[PDB]
UniProtKB/Swiss-Prot annotation, chain B:
Residues modified as N6-(pyridoxal phosphate)lysine: 250
Cystine connections: none
Subunit structure: Homodimer.
Organism: Escherichia coli (strain K12)
Binding-site list for L-aspartate: 38, 134, 187, 378
Lineage per the UniProt record: Bacteria, Pseudomonadati, Pseudomonadota, Gammaproteobacteria, Enterobacterales
Pfam families in the cross-refs: Aminotran_1_2
Biological process terms in GO annotation: L-phenylalanine biosynthetic process; L-phenylalanine biosynthetic process from chorismate via phenylpyruvate
Protein known as: Aspartate aminotransferase
Cofactor(s) this protein cannot do without: pyridoxal 5'-phosphate
Length: 399, 400
């Protein structure tokens, strides 16, 4: 009898991972890593928020058991989540049309959403922006759902091609899922305006799409309430919605895997039937979600003093990002970039496409120890006042 | 007009065990006892955080500088500690680099990841499980498109492991099928194969070309950490290929932190790495990377002499309390004049046993006596205490 594993072929090498290996083996002292996927502060670190440390100290002092949570996790986490998403006093919440499962990260939420849809609905197709978050395709495909792309980003001109977007979505059938990023579109950094969201919501109702809002950066855009505008425009117009949210970034809890999948249906009765099937997809998966990170979030959000500390930390992160964007563009001008990089200031969140070619990206790594990914995506949180000048000088050099 | 996408969804059938739980919570009778629960409880009816766990968490509190993403296979030290627990330190299998471990969200996560990986990367079509087995096995494998078949295991009338029946029913398992075995403390019969039986199963598996999957959730709850790995290791000595889904939920009382692992074993370093590269893909398409807290607690305890000693003692305490309740249950049933013999309870290990009670008797124990058990008649002896034992046993005798 021959082995079951013998004929497996190796997955393709993960290029980003190889790039990290490279950065790891590069002993040059002036390295700048614009390729990372996480927030870094001005010292180049991804620290544990103070509010989180406080919340964790509290849990340590008060926790008396680690016994299984329900399939849907911690109720107060679910409540606080729905409030962040829909606003306090939301008719949708008052009508009890929403249910929320704590999940392992926004990734878990997305996967759980997908399995839930594949097994219980007529959904065949999920539409995502070109480009989008890199793991969307693999998550949705794993559930047996086809992935389609709609027009979004105009690379040459650094713009959201809204007319393109609208026309491309005409191919999306009634009953298809269309996925939108709630804010800080990853990785273009370009979001619809409220008005554009409103057009999008209306069109979705007209065509019969099921909207899925991937909401991983609330507070990194303009602020907590403002970043939910697009979501709430959709929620106001629709009988049904799915929201996959993440606290990985806004709480700096990446590795604790803290997120949620929120179902919204026409009424409480309907969301309950739907939600019972979602709980079954969960049972067939990881059975129940990890407590620590969700408890940390529930602890912060429901305590006025802790919440105020967190909100200020989040503002600090959002503003540090915005000012590295500003600093970046001004420092390129002063170093004689020649080309306009003002689009960086017209974008929000951690990511933008720099517009650099893979040739320029390659030279920047080999020659200047400056690291970006091949598409030219950059994470401006990788910039600091200290590294900005040498970074911009390298960029002018490859231009 | 467009009909809602959720509008016509049929509700999942209600979980009867969750129904019993609400029913219990609402029961005002001060005599009520729940033997249907699924976790460890101490003599005071609590499921506390272990002291070693608290200490480890205080250390993490004081020393953790970041929460940045782990790799897809999680914490390396956790991986190494897992593999030693499974195969023993100095294992030739480890030295040969034939094993790769991914940290996962619980043993459940490990099972699901294993299933998705098999379905996408191999010709495996069927997973065989014991009759009876863990209730969630079927749903997990089915979800990946794998058929689930049962083999003969528990002889319910006589309260034994019908080994001859097991062997013979497995003749139907084809080369390339998965056959799943519980590492120890079979859930929910509490009867495990003897070492000799394990060796027979190992040899048979090799002859038939089955892929063994070891579900290992109770290491430390049977006889001890190393003894409880005997069957797993008997299999590991005979096989080129192997999958183990381990859990730390019960032996570290970290249930809700979701701490487990999926370990692949193949013939050589190269093959295991190719396979493992595909398992990672399965993880990326699911929850992306595993929750750090519980695994980091586990590694912190296991790699520190003094903490590890505090933990092993706590685990021993759990193991011995369970054993004491098994003995006490049998003695008290006798004291209370039970007709039947219940000595099989002493010959079984872990928290779970089938009591032998019918569904009718179980219903009656609830309604009439406030003694809750699950429909199957499975009981959790850790729901028993020196203080609730007598009335509990009188209740059972009265329904026989």
């Amino acid at each position: 009898h021959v082995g079951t594993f013998e004929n497996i072929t190796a997955a393709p090498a993960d290029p980003i991972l190889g790039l990290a290996d490279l950065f790891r083996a590069d002993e040059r002292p002036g390295k700048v890593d614009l390729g990372v996927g996480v927030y870094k502060d001005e010292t180049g670190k991804t620290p544990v928020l103070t509010s989180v440390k406080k919340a964790e100290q509290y849990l340590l002092e008060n926790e008396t058991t680690k016994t299984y949570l329900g399939l849907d996790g911690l109720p107060e986490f679910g409540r606080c989540t729905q409030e962040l998403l829909f606003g306090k006093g939301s008719a949708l919440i008052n009508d009890k049309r929403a249910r929320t499962a704590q999940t392992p990260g926004g990734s878990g939420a997305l996967r759980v959403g997908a399995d839930f849809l594949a097994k219980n609905t007529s959904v065949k197709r999920v539409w995502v922006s070109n480009p989008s978050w890199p793991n969307h395709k693999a998550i949705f495909n794993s559930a047996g759902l086809e992935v389609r792309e709609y027009a979004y980003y105009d690379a040459e001109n650094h713009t959201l091609d809204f007319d393109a977007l609208i026309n491309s979505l005409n191919e999306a059938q009634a009953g298809d899922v269309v996925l939108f990023h709630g804010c800080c579109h990853n990785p273009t950094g370009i979001d619809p305006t409220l008005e554009q969201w409103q057009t999008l919501a209306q069109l979705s109702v007209e065509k019969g799409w099921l909207p899925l809002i991937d909401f991983a950066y609330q507070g990194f855009g303009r602020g907590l309430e403002e970043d939910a505008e697009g979501l709430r425009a959709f929620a106001a117009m629709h009988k049904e919605l799915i929201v996959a949210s993440s606290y990985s970034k806004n709480f700096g809890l990446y590795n604790e895997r803290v997120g949620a999948c929120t179902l919204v249906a026409a009424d409480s009765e309907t969301v309950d039937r739907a939600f019972s099937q979602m709980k079954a997809a969960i049972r067939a998966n990881y059975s129940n979600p990890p407590a620590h990170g969700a408890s940390v979030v529930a602890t912060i959000l429901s305590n006025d003093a802790l919440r105020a500390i967190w909100e200020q930390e989040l503002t600090d992160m959002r503003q540090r990002i915005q000012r590295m964007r500003q600093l970046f563009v001004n420092t390129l001008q002063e170093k004689g970039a020649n080309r306009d990089f003002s689009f960086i200031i017209k974008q929000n969140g951690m990511f933008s496409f720099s517009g650099l070619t893979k040739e320029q990206v390659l030279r920047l790594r080999e020659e200047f120890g400056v690291y970006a990914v091949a598409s030219g995506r950059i994470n401006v949180a990788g910039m600091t006042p200290d590294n900005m000048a040498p970074l911009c000088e390298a960029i002018v050099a490859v231009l």
